[PDB]
Amino acid sequence: SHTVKIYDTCIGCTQCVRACPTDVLEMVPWDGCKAAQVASSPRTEDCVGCKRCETACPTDFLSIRVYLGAETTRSMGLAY
Amino acid sequence: QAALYTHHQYIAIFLMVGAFAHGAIFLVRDYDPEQNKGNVLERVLQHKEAIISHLSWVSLFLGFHTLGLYVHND
Amino acid sequence: GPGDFLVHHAIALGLHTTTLILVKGALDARGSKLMPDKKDFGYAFPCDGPGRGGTCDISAWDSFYLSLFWALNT
Amino acid sequence: DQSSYLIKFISTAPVAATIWLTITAGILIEFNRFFPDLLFHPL
Amino acid sequence: LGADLTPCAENPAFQALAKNARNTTADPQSGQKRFERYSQALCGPEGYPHLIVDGRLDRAGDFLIPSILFLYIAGWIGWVGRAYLQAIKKDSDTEQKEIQLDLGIALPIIATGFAWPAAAVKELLSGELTAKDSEITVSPR
Amino acid sequence: VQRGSKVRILRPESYWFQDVGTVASVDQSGIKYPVIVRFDKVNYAGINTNNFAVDELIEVE
Amino acid sequence: TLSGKTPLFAGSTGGLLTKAVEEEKYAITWTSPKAQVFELPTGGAATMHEGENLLYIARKEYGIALGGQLRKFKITNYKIYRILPSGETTFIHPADGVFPEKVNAGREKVRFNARSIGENPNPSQVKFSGKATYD
Amino acid sequence: KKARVIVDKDPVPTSFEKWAQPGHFDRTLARGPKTTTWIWNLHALAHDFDTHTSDLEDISRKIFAAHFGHLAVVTIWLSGMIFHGAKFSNYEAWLSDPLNVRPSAQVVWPIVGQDILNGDVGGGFHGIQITSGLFQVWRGWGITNSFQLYCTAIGGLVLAGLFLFAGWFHYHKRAPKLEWFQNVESMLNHHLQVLLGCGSLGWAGHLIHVSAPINKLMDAGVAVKDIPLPHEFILNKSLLIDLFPGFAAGLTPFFTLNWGQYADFLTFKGGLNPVTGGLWMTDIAHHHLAIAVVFIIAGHQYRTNWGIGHSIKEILENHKGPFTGEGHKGLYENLTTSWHAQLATNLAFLGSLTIIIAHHMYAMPPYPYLATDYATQLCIFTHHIWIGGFLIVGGAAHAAIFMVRDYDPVVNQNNVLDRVIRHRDAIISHLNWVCIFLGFHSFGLYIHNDTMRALGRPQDMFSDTAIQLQPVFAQWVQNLHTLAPGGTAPNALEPVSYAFGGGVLAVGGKVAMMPIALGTADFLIHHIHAFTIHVTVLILLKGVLFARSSRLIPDKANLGFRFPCDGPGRGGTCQVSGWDHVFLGLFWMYNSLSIVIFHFSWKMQSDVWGTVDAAGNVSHITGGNFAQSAITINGWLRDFLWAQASQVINSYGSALSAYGLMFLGAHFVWAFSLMFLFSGRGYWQELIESIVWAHNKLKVAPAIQPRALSITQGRAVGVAHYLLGGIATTWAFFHAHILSVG
Ligand code: CLA
Ligand code: CLA
Ligand code: CLA
Ligand code: CLA
Ligand code: CLA
Ligand SMILES: CC1=C(C/C=C(\C)CCC[C@H](C)CCC[C@H](C)CCCC(C)C)C(=O)c2ccccc2C1=O
Ligand code: SF4
Ligand code: SF4
Ligand code: SF4
């Protein structure tokens, strides 16, 4: 599966979570930013590696990164 | 003579592209900035924009005028 | 004579432009403005997706790929 | 004012370029019409 | 200079070409006038003017004079272009002034572009030509 | 640094690294990147604002 | 456990292949206020029933996509289930009953790096080691 | 409800304000440029009116006004062509001597030596030889002097003025409401009866009263000065009686159904006029009269304001059967609520029609002295095939744009459109297969042949002298059409085309048209056409059917019509959008039509066109080398491309030199395209970073930040230069060749 890492530069805008077409990401409590929430990637086995989350992320540089790893049936987006 | 010149010039071209390919693989996989602190390799990377911009110029400069003269002549 | 002048200048263009592609590929292999953490993704990778304006052929490997067209042209 | 709007349109990149490169082409074409075949400056 | 170069007025190949010289423009003597001018050049065996670009003063017309005239016009264009960009950057709507020319700003700059070499030297010897490497954006190393 | 102070960026992965931006606000709290800096030129995503830590900034004005 | 009647005009060549029998299958359930037309994940205009609807889908992305379309119909009670060939139905979205874009207490940070992305080590440093530069 | 004129008065105030506000029309663009991507987006979105405003009424008004704009520029162009004919041509010399004088209506200025392009075209005139067939059009019109062209040109400039005013008026001053636009029944009635029906009746009038008499006298060898002016045939009846006795009968035979009294000026001759090698004016007259009647009848089908007539919605709704569920129910709403659904249809069928026109015009040359003008014949065929192919791909594009933007599930549930979406995997899988089958059993035969010939095994080839593949069906149809006159078309004298059979017809020394025999080389090339069309359709149909979704991207409709990808995930999703299928279909359209015009060019030069000996023996331009050469790729490379490129490459220092320059220029533009197609944005943005660094270093960094072209623009620029370069090459090739041999 692909690896999705969140970095402490996250502002908790939730845009990555909303963008994700396979519900990999979710918002979890945090004290690090004003929004008081950080992105998390609990379900990276469902990550297809589309990088919609990175396109969504408004921080410079990105606070979410997808590192494309071992390809599986779920990661290759196969219905067969 | 034609075969042997073409053959070796084609090989030379592959070896030259490989040299730069493996040079890029070195930079991305092997190059330690901390071990190369202050040396010629770090300095080259420090003004890489200046090197690439001047290469862009020489290429454009050669390209415009050489194609220009050929097209003029043609 | 004049024919040898124009074609030597075409060869120079060829050598500088192949170099430009490969050197740019080498010196941007570890990162650029568009992809600052490029070293984390290695030598060969498809892209970093259509975000930030699009990043097709952004890897150091993709400079090797582009350079060989110019190497063959030259 | 409608004059100000035309001047702004004339000064817009593609219209400004067209007028300027037409003048530049015109100058070059006419110079070559009255002084053709200048391969070098004669001495 | 070299590779069977003779004065064009001595090369039989040139005279042969001159007798069948095509009229470039409406002027019916334009064909002859061309070969009359090109007679002073060096011609190869086939009778085409070859240009010598080594900075020989007796061949200054070939490349040296065209070079000076080009560098003066190209430098004008570049300086006027640079001048305008620096002028509009001091205003508020700089991006709009790029795609929609402020002729009030542009035309005076264009007019004063004849004196670009003086302006280029002055600005080179004032540290006002370049920015500092530390104040220009760069990629991570 | 405070509101209106021109700052140069020291973050090397920042689009605006060694570019000048205006400090829009400084969040008076314990957050790691409290200083909101606006920029004249947009990045590749098209945004012109970003959060920075005080150590990543040099006040120039 | 999955209750709901299959929507009308649910048939197309874009439906379940042999994977659904051999590897895994997904279901998406939702309660509709009214019978209304909706575009299927893989083409075709299907009709929702008033009440519980059950649609089998090859990929979880079909469920999330359809979920997004159901939100445009003012429906937010959709549940996606992964179904294995042993008939082991697993409720997978929303994981904890709250939608992931909304913050819920109890969720822990997963794959969080307490650094800026610029502060990752060089590939040379983690060379011949198990770890990567983003670890 | 009733069709009626209903407009809003002064909807948009006319002012230059918005001319000074680039990108005013889009909310995003209105904010202004920040990067150079903005400058591209401005042009890209300019005429995408659906993105300007949501209001269908405002979109309909913009489209109606824009059309008056496009009619004005086309009228300016047609007026220009006729003006250049009146002022800068050898038309009058060409009328006096059609066979010897070469048509020319473009004179070059004497500057930088380009006057060489003003070649000796005959009629003591120096200019570029034209291949647009304007001289043959004007001769067919019965125009015999420069003054008649001047009048027609000025008339055109006035019509172009009227079209500009109309477009301004019908947008800024009196803009029709959406009600008006959605009267499809009234529009079809008026466009069938007036535009086509009355246009065809009107033209029958001109043919019968002006063209047929003037052409008949010119074919009788009467001097152009001696021929009466076209109004003298109306004012002086005696002159017209002398040419066509049927006019003696007057208009009473028309009203009393004694139509045989007009058999002399309304004919069904068939074949070609032996003098001119064009269709008979009297056949063309009767055609346009018959067309006019059928159209005026046809355009009384649709109900407007008087109950009588069909409603198209009821027709569509009633056409359903046991395979197609609700059938054509909901398609009326698609075609009356989406402009893209209409543009898709109209581009697909106008494109298909333009290709039919290409075929019908070479085989049945309708204009006098067209058939023997081999340069015009080749060029108008190739031209109209290209226009046809582009329009068809446009049809597919706008079909995909409709599916993404304007398709409603509610309107289109269990109808023909809905049901095709539900077996799209079965459609595309079968079309995929037939493409591979055709590819192997069409192209593979050429590869078989090349290999057999190369191995010194000609007996093992697919050829007329080896393993034959005779196109027996096309051969059988040719025979039926040849036997038609006297048989299944009793009142025809000759066949519709000599291409089907009959004799060699010759005008001057040259073959106007003769029978186009089909053998193994014709069977092979026809199955190549079938292949290259089926693959283009595979790409475009896949584009339209998978525009909204696929098994890969379920929510593709949300990403839109024109997006570069959905990222490197799922293995990589590059070029999944309906836009990207159009991009790929253009290359295949280009590949397909290239082989069509190459087929036409070589087949006509080897088997049709050529000189005719007094005895009647036909010596063809390439001496019938098609049968044995056009069955291998080597034969195409050698006997077609290599052989016929001699004229274009040897054109320097002559009047055809321009085609030699265009030939290289086009090869360059084509090769340049490969930079855009083979590369990606990422590389170019990183190169621009370093160039921007140097501009920053010297304080010349632009406020509008430079960006590499978008992924989509990269592809758009790629395919644009590829098509331009490729097509322009063949254009230069065809001209230089056919202006020498033809
Ligand atoms: C001189 C010695 C040399 C050595 C020891 C290496 C070694 C290596 N190279 Mg380098 N390289 C070299 C020269 C060399 N290279 C040259 C001259 C070039 C320029 C072309 C390159 C360009 C290059 C690139 C771009 C990359 C490497 C990579 C590598 C590594 C992996 C290679 C691999 O697994 O591919 C497996 C082998 C193949 C895929 C071979 C298939 C390609 C051949 C040529 C196909 C030929 C077609 C067909 C057979 C002909 C048909 C005939 C027709 C008539 C039908 C390995 C460390 C890779 C790496 O990641 O480095 C760590 C990598 O990405 N090399
Ligand atoms: C004929 C084919 C062709 C041509 C002309 C080019 C030209 C160029 N390439 Mg490209 N390239 C090509 C094929 C080609 N490439 C292919 C197949 C690939 C593989 C994908 C690439 C991949 C590639 C890479 C990776 C790079 C290049 C770069 C370049 C530039 C080198 C700069 C230079 O020396 O020339 C000077 C410029 C020219 C010769 C351009 C043409 C000048 C025109 C004709 C003048 C036009 C003016 C005229 C009035 C306009 C008329 C048009 C009208 C509509 C207004 C040059 C623009 C490099 C670059 O950008 O360096 C700066 C670079 O890094 N190319
Ligand atoms: C004022 C305008 C200006 C100035 C002073 C420069 C200066 C420079 N350019 Mg840049 N450049 C410009 C505009 C300018 N450029 C534009 C509009 C483009 C987009 C085509 C580029 C694209 C570009 C590339 C790709 C490269 C350069 C490079 C360079 C450097 C080397 C010289 C060269 O290669 O010329 C190159 C010239 C061109 C590509 C054509 C220039 C087009 C026109 C003539 C300039 C614009 C004039 C403007 C419209 C005038 C308006 C003035 C008015 C409002 C008063 C030099 C610092 C090179 C470099 O980095 O060297 C280290 C390099 O590789 N430039
Ligand atoms: C009556 C015919 C017709 C009409 C009214 C339209 C109308 C439209 N098209 Mg459709 N289209 C058509 C035919 C037509 N098209 C054809 C024949 C094709 C096949 C190529 C297409 C393929 C197509 C695509 C792929 C797309 C459209 C889109 C659109 C919309 C936006 C267009 C725009 O803003 O262009 C702006 C104009 C430009 C960017 C300039 C175009 C210049 C072209 C590329 C090259 C011209 C070269 C020329 C022939 C030679 C001169 C060369 C010389 C100058 C050097 C608009 C509704 C777009 C859309 O999004 O729909 C909603 C869209 O993405 N069309
Ligand atoms: C010469 C260049 C070339 C060739 C050979 C192909 C071939 C193909 N294209 Mg491609 N295409 C090309 C250029 C080419 N393309 C370019 C430049 C583009 C960019 C626009 C595309 C974009 C493209 C699209 C978008 C599509 C295609 C499709 C196809 C396939 C059509 C089906 C078919 O005919 O199968 C039959 C195979 C052939 C005709 C190839 C030659 C067969 C030989 C003669 C027989 C085999 C000999 C022997 C047994 C070899 C093995 C033995 C050996 C190992 C010892 C076919 C494989 C389509 C497709 O896949 O649909 C089915 C499709 O949709 N292509
Ligand atoms: C070459 C190339 C580029 C680089 C090309 C670019 C950025 C286009 C820029 C060219 C235009 C012509 C610059 C015009 C600048 C000014 C408007 C010119 C002003 C001067 C005139 C008035 C004379 C891409 O950006 C790209 C993107 C995606 C896939 C492939 C490619 C690709 O192949
Ligand atoms: S790469 Fe795609 S699937 Fe993976 S987390 Fe990001 S948005 Fe979700
Ligand atoms: S990772 Fe980026 S997009 Fe996601 S919540 Fe954090 S800042 Fe927002
Ligand atoms: S189109 Fe470009 S950005 Fe998108 S997935 Fe392909 S390579 Fe990556």
Author numbering:
A (entry chain C): 2 to 81
B (entry chain B): 372 to 445
C (entry chain B): 520 to 593
D (entry chain J): 6 to 48
E (entry chain F): 24 to 164
F (entry chain E): 2 to 62
G (entry chain D): 4 to 138
H (entry chain A): 11 to 752
Task: Please give the exact wording used by the authors of the publication that reports this structure.
When cyanobacteria are exposed to iron deficiency, they express iron-stress-induced-A proteins (IsiAs)18–20 encoded by the isiA genes, which are one of the membrane-embedded light-harvesting complexes (LHCs). IsiAs have been observed to associate with PSI but not PSII, hence contribute to the photochemical reactions of PSI under iron-deficient conditions in various cyanobacteria. The central part of the light-energy conversion is two multi-subunit pigment-protein complexes, photosystem I and photosystem II (PSI and PSII, respectively), which perform light-driven charge separation and a series of electron-transfer reactions. The cyanobacterium Anabaena sp. PCC 7120 has four isiA genes; however, their binding property and functional roles in PSI are still missing.
